[PDB]
Design a protein around this ligand. Sequence first.
Ligand SMILES: N#CCC(=O)Nc1cccc(C(F)(F)F)c1
Lengths: 237, 300
Amino acid sequence: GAMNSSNYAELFNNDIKLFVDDTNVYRVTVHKTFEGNVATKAINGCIFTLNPKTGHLFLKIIHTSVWAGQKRLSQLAKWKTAEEVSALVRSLPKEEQPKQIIVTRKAMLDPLEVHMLDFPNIAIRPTELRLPFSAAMSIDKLSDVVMKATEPQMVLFNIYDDWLDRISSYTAFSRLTLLLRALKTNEESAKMILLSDPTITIKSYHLWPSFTDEQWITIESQMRDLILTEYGRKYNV
Amino acid sequence: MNTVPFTSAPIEVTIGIDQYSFNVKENQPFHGIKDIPIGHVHVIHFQHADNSSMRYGYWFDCRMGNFYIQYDPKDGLYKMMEERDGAKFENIVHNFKERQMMVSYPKIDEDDTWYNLTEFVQMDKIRKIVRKDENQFSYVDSSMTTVQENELSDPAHSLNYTVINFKSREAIRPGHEMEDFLDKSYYLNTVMLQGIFKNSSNYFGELQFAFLNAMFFGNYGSSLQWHAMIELICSSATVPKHMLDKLDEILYYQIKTLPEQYSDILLNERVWNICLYSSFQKNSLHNTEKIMENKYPELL
Ligand SMILES: N#CCC(=O)Nc1cccc(C(F)(F)F)c1
């Protein structure tokens, strides 16, 4: 059934699984028209499909042209997501296909189940975790490739950079979700934390800076402080 | 008018005949039911006084043979049987009518309720849902499960209703996933009507039979089938106009006949609120919506 704190280590066993987040699929700016009405303008989006064991990120960029002439876009966005995830699974060799797909929002369950009817043995699961994957577009290199896309495009990343050389996938995922939770709660502060020191750079082939083990501990502590703070600044505590 | 003779009534039992019912005391001189209208299927059903568990009964059509009821003390139930000796049966029925040992099927002349509940129900189709080909009548009880229930375990004793499953490859054309899931017209009209049922009469007949088994026996899988067949129509944007008008009449009389006290178990809140207030056909069921709102406004 649903994924929660009780069955959290299952994410890091050797059964291939993917998280699918659809938050950033259908993105709009809201603006005033000349007549003083309101309208939306779509901007490029992305499906965030992540292997939590390996860090492999299948970033399917959603170009605004896919919405042209369509109605009920927030509903279509769920089905488009499910179509693209199903096409991704079909594109993978059988031994790379996931045994479970975990959707971060329950409204993706029926669209994905219907698109995956051909794969009855792939479990489509919700989760009770409040995962911060919406903040993926706060990672500069991911935001950049989404905004620059002129057509539909899949781009492959490892969201853990080289961390798994030194840490386990449980620890890497916990780092990732802490970084993303921070970026979601206070993006400017989080990004200041990550880049304040100019001597630590981001490798061309990486998403995050090249922190030493000790520097990650400092960074990680700064993100927790940020999240706790904002949680005070928010509730006044 | 036809007759169903009872050898005897050895155990106290509530006997139903269609929507009517009466109590028979242990060893009361009861020898059956007379004046049963020709032209309709009927159901004679039983609930023992000592064990309200297992309502059970028999669908039959007196045009298809001479049927009677004999209690079986080994299997512990009232059994329907067929008398092939027509002269035996006429002689046995005339004796019991002369001794006035029978109840009269108590139809008010104004009253079209039973016709309205069984309009599309045919014995031949019942016998394909309830498989026991050596008999002309069909036994149903509270506990029988449906083919679909058995997929999710004795096949001989199953209700072989048509399997409807909105998240199935039968229901969803590759490449039309979102279209077919949000508007089930393809599944209703092409797969089910044209493909499986052949016409809307057979569809309505199975819907009506499922409702009746749900109401008379508390058969849970029948209730599931009834609601699925309603929902399949209401969730289709394209439905023949005559089907919608007939559906509205069908459901109206089902809701009218339902015991007020069984609505909590026989009616699925989600299905009804979706069909009457959200679905494509939310505005096409005027009679049904009006009787539902006046009789069960709590469900909605
Ligand atoms: N003898 C014998 C078996 C048998 O066939 N008995 C039988 C047949 C037809 C109707 C009736 C009833 F009216 F007494 F119910 C009984």
